[PDB]
Amino acid sequence: PGPPGPPGEKGDRGFPGPPGPPGPPG
Amino acid sequence: PPGPPGPPGEKGDRGFPGPPGPPGPPG
Amino acid sequence: PGPPGPPGEKGDRGFPGPPGPPGPP
Helix, strand or coil: CCCCCCCCCCCCCCCCCCCCCCCCCC | CCCCCCCCCCCCCCCCCCCCCCCCCCC | CCCCCCCCCCCCCCCCCCCCCCCCC
């Protein structure tokens, strides 16, 4: 049988991160 | 003959969280 | 033909998130 195929396409970029923590109480 | 290409890769990790918000005002 | 190739590489990490909301007064 033949060799394995080439590597697949690179995945999509991740989603942007969430907003940061709420700031401290004043 | 070589096989077909592998599957597309997985989606990347979500970005890190942003920094803390500003403090509340003194008043 | 041979087997499928290796899975593609994982995607890049997303962009960092925005600043958090303001703290309470």
